[PDB]
Design an enzyme around this catalytic site. Sequence first.
Site, PDB file in Angstrom:
ATOM      1  N   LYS D 158      23.415 -13.996  25.972  1.00  0.00           N
ATOM      2  CA  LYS D 158      22.881 -12.655  26.449  1.00  0.00           C
ATOM      3  C   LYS D 158      21.822 -12.783  27.293  1.00  0.00           C
ATOM      4  O   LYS D 158      21.968 -12.070  28.489  1.00  0.00           O
ATOM      5  N   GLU D 184      12.707 -11.719  20.611  1.00  0.00           N
ATOM      6  CA  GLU D 184      13.530 -12.886  21.186  1.00  0.00           C
ATOM      7  C   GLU D 184      12.628 -14.048  20.538  1.00  0.00           C
ATOM      8  O   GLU D 184      11.327 -14.005  20.736  1.00  0.00           O
ATOM      9  N   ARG D 185      13.448 -15.046  20.639  1.00  0.00           N
ATOM     10  CA  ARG D 185      12.986 -16.307  20.012  1.00  0.00           C
ATOM     11  C   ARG D 185      12.253 -17.245  21.048  1.00  0.00           C
ATOM     12  O   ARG D 185      12.329 -16.801  22.254  1.00  0.00           O
TER      13      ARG D 185
END
Lengths: 85, 85, 53, 470, 469
Positions: D158, D184-185
């Site tokens: 993504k 988000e990571r």
Amino acid sequence: GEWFRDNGKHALIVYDDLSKQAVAYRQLSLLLRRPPGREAYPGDVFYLHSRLLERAAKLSEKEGSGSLTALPVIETQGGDVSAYI
Amino acid sequence: GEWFRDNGKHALIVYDDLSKQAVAYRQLSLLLRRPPGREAYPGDVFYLHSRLLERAAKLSEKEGSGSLTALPVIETQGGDVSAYI
Amino acid sequence: QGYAAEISARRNAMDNASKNAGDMINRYSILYNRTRQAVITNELVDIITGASS
Amino acid sequence: STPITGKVTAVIGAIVDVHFEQSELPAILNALEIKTPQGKLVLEVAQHLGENTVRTIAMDGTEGLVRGEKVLDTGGPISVPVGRETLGRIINVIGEPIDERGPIKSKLRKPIHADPPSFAEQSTSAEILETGIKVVDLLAPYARGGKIGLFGGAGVGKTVFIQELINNIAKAHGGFSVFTGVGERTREGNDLYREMKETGVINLEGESKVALVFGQMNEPPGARARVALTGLTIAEYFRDEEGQDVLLFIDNIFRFTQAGSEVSALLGRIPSAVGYQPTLATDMGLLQERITTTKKGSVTSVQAVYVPADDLTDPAPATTFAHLDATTVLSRGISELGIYPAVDPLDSKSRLLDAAVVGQEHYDVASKVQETLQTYKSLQDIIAILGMDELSEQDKLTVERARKIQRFLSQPFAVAEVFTGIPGKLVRLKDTVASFKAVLEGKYDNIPEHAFYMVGGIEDVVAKAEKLAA
Amino acid sequence: TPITGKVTAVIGAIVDVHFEQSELPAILNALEIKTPQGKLVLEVAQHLGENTVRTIAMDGTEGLVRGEKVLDTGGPISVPVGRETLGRIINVIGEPIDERGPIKSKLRKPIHADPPSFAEQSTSAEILETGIKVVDLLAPYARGGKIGLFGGAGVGKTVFIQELINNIAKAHGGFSVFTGVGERTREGNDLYREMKETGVINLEGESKVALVFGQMNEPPGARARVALTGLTIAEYFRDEEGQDVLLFIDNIFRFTQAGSEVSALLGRIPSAVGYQPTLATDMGLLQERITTTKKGSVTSVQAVYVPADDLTDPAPATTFAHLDATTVLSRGISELGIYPAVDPLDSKSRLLDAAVVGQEHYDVASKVQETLQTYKSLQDIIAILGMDELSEQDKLTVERARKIQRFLSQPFAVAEVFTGIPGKLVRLKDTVASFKAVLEGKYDNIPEHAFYMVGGIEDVVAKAEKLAA
């Protein structure tokens, strides 16, 4: 039935239909605001049925061989025997 | 693990079964009377799991370059992955 | 003579197959519909419990 | 400071109830700051419960809190810093840096709640953004000021898709961009931070044509909710106050859904369908309406969405599906076929596709492409069981063209010089229309299917035909 | 001691007492409320403040006049254990209900006890075999182990367990415990009678068996502590007598089920489906008090009445956690007519391995699993288009798999009453040889019906002669 049973005399009892008892106990329980069990049928439905059924017996020789056969008549939901009741 | 990671030593952490952690937090939450999230796992189970998992990392060389690696182990009940946990 | 019978058989078999598959379609569809109801119920119970508490 | 002093009464998770004094009057949507050894904990006032006892939501963590703790009131919606000094700086939820370039702010701060522009304010535009990604351009024409939506299943690269878009569109684009990351990571974050330093869009010296707002899922759900609001206001500041057009980017808005679902439940607002908040629609509406083409500016959002278990019948993706201008669905099968991008083009619909709007030639070509690919898919079952050759010669030629076209969708990506090694291709819109038209005419059916695979335009297709020939 | 209370409430058999005296019994204490009909033993489970406890009542509440005097009998209920509990059938209280008169109690032990420590574990691996082929091939047991059975109870489920008692416990020298929660009274009477007959219980002389019987008539709360009661008796054997024990539990779904009912009444908001929030902890504690310790390794057989065969209901799922072997029994396979009605892709033991039970056994089992998995895989394909219209190689496999399924059908000894077929217990070594041959199609020259409901390979051959007639 138990008066006959407890004469030692042999009897029989047909409980038609306990499925309608389940709906009844459901109604009563829900109106008592007891949390819905699975299939909306209360959690003590097992207890109700087991208490009812296990009072029918072939008593011991002492008790005069008190028969009271039990034949409970269950109206299977769509013929699907997998179903809680 | 972070002590190893901090030393610059690399390590790997298996969290088996993380699924059982969720059951445990469910028990706690419902007896802390906290509102139940879907599937009775409280709606902040994600917060617990997310913070846990993000503590495995590959540090910068100024931060040593240590690295804890993680392998969480989640049981899928009936292979159901649409399940909240 | 053979080739005509061969193709005739192929047609026959393939027709009966469509029927057999249809029967199975119907059987799993009813099961699907019941299963759908059960999911709704199980979710509904969760909501009821939540509202209750 | 302010007489508005509240003493904490209950820490019941993120929900922290405060007991402001009777004289003092707080208000819904305010921001409370509590001085802590863990910066200032921000609590967003979300209810009044009576006798100046509020129920507020925490942004930061709630460890070590002592019930009875004096609470200052900021006095209104969380105030970020705004400026053109926000460019190329990572801004956390409360506004504090993560880029660590010291005080972010020009001379202004602004509240993060703002209203969606009214009907009167709305200004329509038919302008066409160009992705420079040939398949995307042709079969899903994008629009400037639009609300592009990267719907897809699990992590379909993504970030990668967004990176390509930034690589092409952003550098070309003269306005600003805002990259907003919701939960988000931090691995992905570090890659993005590095990557946009590398692409120089974060221009270390001089102005950056992107700004950054990195949210980490580690941060409590409350912070996850109002990272979105923060990013939204930054775009508004650019759109409005700086007047410039922007290209907003948000990531991943299902994480926004999950976050909102959680704090709904915590607020006691019983979560609706599939555990998703009853206020989901209206919350979506506020975000979405806020993003639009005004007369002050134009902002093209590209918002990533994670579709749980690829079920878009699920209410949360489906609700978002309505609000977005220009949907695209990234599909695993096509990814596995090796095609980059992974979009299933028969599963991509952009609002701009009207015949004269995209131009009659473009339209006619696009109708033909859709049919050609659709023919291959429909025929795939026949080719599979009955056999390839039993089909008509005409059908077979359409299949052959489709296989060539299918692999002419394959555009090796610049940001997949690390995911494939093979450089990008930036193909002009006109060039794509022409090259696809040619293929359909069957002018390059003497060029192998694999000589379209992982190469650009017609010039490249021919070059790889020659290359394979050699 | 006399520590008074009154019965403030009787909301089900989850009575609430108000101990008037501020001296408040502790949690897991036991209380005696005196009644004209015996007494009631209640167990403190909550303190709800203002010296008002909420107490589980282990007897069926009725007649209670609101505000009834209490006396505190203190601590966890202490059952009576002994060699004089051998033979006896004991009530939850511990009262010998088979009326072999009072137990000469040596030790009376608390119902609640704590599972042995991680260091105290002694981890076994000794093979226990039954002589049931399907069991031996697919999931061989181990003595001291934790065995598990699932599916509809008393669908011959009870019979299956009875067969295990017949086989395994007439090959076990140590003590053995049968504890039947929600047991069917007639079946229990038969079992007791059978036990007395087979000398396993002998009224005169010793009994290497002890019995606990809990009828499903008995109120949920009683059923909840039937398990703990039996578990204590087991500890006496495990620890105090030291000796290795068998144990049967039938059904522990009734334990879980009972818990969910009382939890609601207790006031605990009900977790998913309805189950008690403490489901995991209670099951865990209980099944680790049947553990393999340096002091004894207790062979357990656990029977789960999986409700509507919802294994996904958390209680059966969490049973798998506390098991080393499972033998999930499938209603479908019962419908297929197979006795044993064991699901063959849902049986497992950690004892199944290529060196634990050897490579040859493992290979044979591997092939059986693969063959059957193929056959199941092609079930759609076969039905829509005949197996004739499927591949020839596969058609051999399909025909073979039909034979294998039938081969797994084996009559059983106390199934002999119901089935009318004399039982078969076939040696494990024989089983491996027999299945190996069938897989090599050596005997796949004779009818599929030959393999059905018979023991050893030799029996199949003999039955071929029978079929030929």
